[PDB]
Amino acid sequence: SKVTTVVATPGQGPDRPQEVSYTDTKVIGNGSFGVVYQAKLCDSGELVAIKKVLQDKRFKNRELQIMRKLDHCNIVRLRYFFYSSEVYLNLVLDYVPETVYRVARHYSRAKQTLPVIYVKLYMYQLFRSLAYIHSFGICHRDIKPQNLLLDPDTAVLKLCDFGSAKQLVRGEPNVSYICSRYYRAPELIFGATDYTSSIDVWSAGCVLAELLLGQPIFPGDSGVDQLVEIIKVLGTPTREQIREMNPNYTEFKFPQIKAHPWTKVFRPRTPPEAIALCSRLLEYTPTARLTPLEACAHSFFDELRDPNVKLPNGRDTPALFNFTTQELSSNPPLATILIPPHAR
Amino acid sequence: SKVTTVVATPGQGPDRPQEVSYTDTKVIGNGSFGVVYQAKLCDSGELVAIKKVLQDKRFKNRELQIMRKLDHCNIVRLRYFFYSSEVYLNLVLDYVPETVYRVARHYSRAKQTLPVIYVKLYMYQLFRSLAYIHSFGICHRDIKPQNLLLDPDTAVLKLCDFGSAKQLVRGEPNVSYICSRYYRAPELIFGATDYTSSIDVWSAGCVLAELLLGQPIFPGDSGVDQLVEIIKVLGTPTREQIREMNPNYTEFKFPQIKAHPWTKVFRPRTPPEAIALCSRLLEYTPTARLTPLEACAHSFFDELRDPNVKLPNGRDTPALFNFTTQELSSNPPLATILIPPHAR
Ligand SMILES: Cn1cc(C2=C(c3cccc(NC[C@H](O)CO)c3)C(=O)NC2=O)c2cc(F)ccc21
Ligand SMILES: Cn1cc(C2=C(c3cccc(NC[C@H](O)CO)c3)C(=O)NC2=O)c2cc(F)ccc21
C-alpha cells in the first residue's frame, strides 16, 4: 500500500499547513461531486474521505469556502484541504460508512420499516445540522437520503455533500434547478429563483415521510408527476400559494383536488406526532414550514429527551443536546425544550 | 374470466358508439398516467391496453382530445373510449408488449449493446411519430425510453402516454416542469416557459445517445448535475444561448468548459453517422436542432432505405415509408430521400 504525504491546510483552524500522511487509498465514489476516495490517516489510524475536484481558474471554490466555516457533530467535517496535480482541490473529510439511502433500502427490501427510534434519532440530527447551517444563512440545496451518512453503531448522522450549498441572500437570485427528484420543494418545481432555506426543510419532511412510508411520498420522474403526488396529499394550492411559487403560473389550470387527511397517508401504526411533524414540514407556503430548530423541539422527538432512552444495541444515544449559541440563535427560548434537565 | 361489455366511442371515426366486449382484464400498470389494464377483445382476439383516469368536472380531457386526432403506425392508437364508474374516462389502446426502457436494460446488464440495426429502426420510427405529432403542433413533452413501446418480432415502435402532450401555441406560456430526468432539454432545466416542440427532439437525441452508450448520456438526479453532464459534452453555453434558455440567468456564473469532441463521447466502434446525428439533435439552440422529419432523412438511417435490409430474424422491416402529406408538411422535398425508389 502506497503512503501518500501531502502538505495540507486544517479545515477551520489558522492557515498553518501540516504534513499529512495517508494510506489504504481506494475510490468509493465517482459522480458530479467528483471523485471520492476513502483512506486511512497514518498518524491516527482514522479513516477519512477525500473529495477531489478540478479547481476552476477564475473563481474561488464555493464548497471549500462554506466547509471552512462549519464545525458541527452532525455535519461531515473538513479536516484538511490540499492541492494536487491542471490543479485539483482535495478535501479531507470525516468518513462515515453508511447512508440513510442504503439503510432505508435494506429495510424496504426486507419488507420492514425502520424502527421509529431511528427515525427520531436521524431526523432530529438532520434538523440540528440544518439549524446550524441555516444560522449562517447557508442552504444545502440537496437534502436527500444519499446525503445523510450514518454510523450504525453510534446512530450518529452526518450531512454530507456541500457541492450545491450556498449562502442565500435576500433579493439575490438563485438557480431553481437544484435539489434532487423526490425531494424538491414545489416552489423549485415551479422554477422559483427567490426561494429561502426552507426548501431544505421541505426536503427533510420528504425524507421523514419516506422513512415512515418505506418509499418516497412524492415520487415522479418529472415535475408534473411530482406535483400530482404533492397535490394528492396537500390538496390544490390556493391562488396565493401558486403566485408565491411562481408569479407567471396563476393563469394555468389546476384540478380542484381535496386534501387527503394526513393520517390516511401513512400506515396505521405510525405515531401521530410523526404525522403532525410531517404536516408542518410539507407546507406549500415556505414561511409556514417549521424551522429546523423548531422541528428539533417538536414533540415527535420528546423520546430523545427522556433520560432513560437507549439505542437498541444497549449503548447511550449520541450527542443530542450540546447546542451552541450560534445553533440556538434563530430562537434562544427553544433551549428550554431542547436542552432537557438531565443534560444541563 | 369476466367478460365486460361497454358502449364505447371509436377513437377517430364518426361519433357512433358500439358495444365492445373484452376479457382477461389485468392491471399492468399504475402511476400518474393512472391505472392501465391489459385485456383481450372478444370479437377479434386482439390484445388492448385500457387507460383509466378520473375525469375532472370542470374541463375536457386534453389527452382524449389529442388522441382522437391521431392515427399513425408509430403511435399507440386510441381504438375506443368510454366512461365508467365519480366518473372515469377509459382509453382503449393498441397493446404493445415491450419497451425500449426494458430492452436497453436487458442489453445493459448482459454487458451487450443493442445492435445498431435496432437503434436505426427504433430511432427512425420515433422520429416519424414526432414528425407526425409536431405537424399538428402537438408536443409530447415526455419522450423517454419507457414511453417507447416495441414489438420484438416485427420491430415496430409505438410512442405512448400522451398524458403530458400539448398543442404548443406561440406566445402562449407552457409549464416548464414537464419531461423526465435524463431527457429534459436544457431550456426546461432553466425553467423556460416558451419552449417549442424541439424539446421532444432533444429528448430523442438523449434516447439515441443512451442506446449507443449503454447508459444515459446526461445523468443526474438534479438539474444541476444534469447541466454539469450536458456542459461536459457540449461545452459551456454562450451568453446568447443562456439568454435564450432563460433571460434571468445571464448573470449567473458559468465555468468555462471546452467542448468534448463528440467522437470521444461514444465507444470506438460507434458508427460516425450516429454520432453526427446526435450532435445535430443535442444542440443548445432549439432552432439549431434537426426537425424530426430531417432526422428521418439523416444518413444514419440510409441502411433502412436499402431494398435489401432485413430484420435479424429474417423478416422484412416494418412499414417505414408510408408517409402521408400531413407527415411530410414541414418539408415536402424531403420525400425524395425519405421514400426510396423501391418503395414508390
Ligand atoms: C458511504 N460514503 C460516505 C461518503 C462520504 C462523503 C461524501 C463526500 C462527497 C459526496 C458524498 N455524497 C453521498 C455519497 O454518494 C453517499 O451516498 C459523500 C464524505 O464527505 N464523507 C464520507 O464518509 C461517500 C462518498 C461516496 F462517493 C460514496 C460513498 C460514501
Ligand atoms: C408494456 N406496456 C405497454 C403499455 C401500454 C400503454 C401505456 C399507456 C399509458 C402509459 C404508458 N406508459 C409507459 C409504460 O409504463 C411502459 O413503460 C403506457 C399503451 O397506451 N399501450 C400499451 O400497450 C403499458 C402500460 C403500463 F402501465 C405498463 C406497461 C405497459
UniProtKB/Swiss-Prot annotation, chains A, B:
**Record annotation: effect of changing L89A:** Abolishes activity toward AXIN1
The processes (GO biological process) annotated in the record are: canonical Wnt signaling pathway; cell differentiation; cellular response to amyloid-beta; cellular response to interleukin-3; cellular response to retinoic acid; circadian rhythm; epithelial to mesenchymal transition; ER overload response
Signal peptide, first to last residue: none
Residues recorded as bearing Phosphotyrosine in the entry: Y177
Alphabetized UniProt keyword annotations: ADP-ribosylation, Alzheimer disease, ATP-binding, Biological rhythms, Carbohydrate metabolism, Cell membrane, Cytoplasm, Developmental protein, Diabetes mellitus, Differentiation, Glycogen metabolism, Kinase, Lipoprotein, Membrane, Neurogenesis, Nucleotide-binding, Nucleus, Palmitate, Phosphoprotein, Serine/threonine-protein kinase, Signal transduction inhibitor, Transferase, Wnt signaling pathway
For the keyword Lipid metabolism, the answer is: no
**What are this entry's molecular-function GO terms?**
ATP binding; beta-catenin binding; dynactin binding; kinase activity; NF-kappaB binding; p53 binding; protease binding; protein kinase A catalytic subunit binding
Top enzyme class, one word, equals transferase
User: What do the Gene Ontology cellular component annotations say?
Assistant: axon; beta-catenin destruction complex; centrosome; cytoplasm; cytosol; dendrite; glutamatergic synapse; mitochondrion
Q: Which residues form the active site?
A: D142
Q: What is its EC number?
A: 2.7.11.26, 2.7.11.1
Localisation per UniProt entry: Cytoplasm; Nucleus; Cell membrane
Its tissue distribution reads:
Expressed in testis, thymus, prostate and ovary and weakly expressed in lung, brain and kidney. Colocalizes with EIF2AK2/PKR and TAU in the Alzheimer disease (AD) brain.
State what inhibits or activates this protein. Answer: Activated by phosphorylation at Tyr-177. Inhibited by lithium.
The UniProt record gives the binding positions of ATP as I28, G29, N30, G31, S32, F33, G34, V35, V36, K51
Subunit description? Monomer. Interacts with ARRB2, DISC1 and ZBED3. Interacts with CABYR, MMP2, MUC1, NIN and PRUNE1. Interacts with AXIN1; the interaction mediates hyperphosphorylation of CTNNB1 leading to its ubiquitination and destruction. Interacts with and phosphorylates SNAI1. Interacts with DNM1L (via a C-terminal domain). Found in a complex composed of MACF1, APC, AXIN1, CTNNB1 and GSK3B. Interacts with SGK3. Interacts with DAB2IP (via C2 domain); the interaction stimulates GSK3B kinase activation. Interacts (via C2 domain) with PPP2CA. Interacts with the CLOCK-BMAL1 heterodimer.
| Role | Constitutively active protein kinase that acts as a negative regulator in the hormonal control of glucose homeostasis, Wnt signaling and regulation of transcription factors and microtubules, by phosphorylating and inactivating glycogen synthase (GYS1 or GYS2), EIF2B, CTNNB1/beta-catenin, APC, AXIN1, DPYSL2/CRMP2, JUN, NFATC1/NFATC, MAPT/TAU and MACF1. Requires primed phosphorylation of the majority of its substrates. In skeletal muscle, contributes to insulin regulation of glycogen synthesis by phosphorylating and inhibiting GYS1 activity and hence glycogen synthesis.
- Family membership, please give it: Belongs to the protein kinase superfamily. CMGC Ser/Thr protein kinase family. GSK-3 subfamily.
Q: What else is known?
A: Higher expression and activity of GSK3B are found in the skeletal muscle (vastus lateralis) of patients with type 2 diabetes. Several potent GSK3 (GSK3A and GSK3B) inhibitors have been identified and characterized in preclinical models for treatments of type 2 diabetes.
Name of the featured protein:
Glycogen synthase kinase-3 beta
Q: What broad taxonomic lineage does this protein's source fall under?
A: Eukaryota, Metazoa, Chordata, Craniata, Vertebrata
Gene that codes for this? GSK3B
**Residue span relative to the full protein:** 35 to 383 of 420
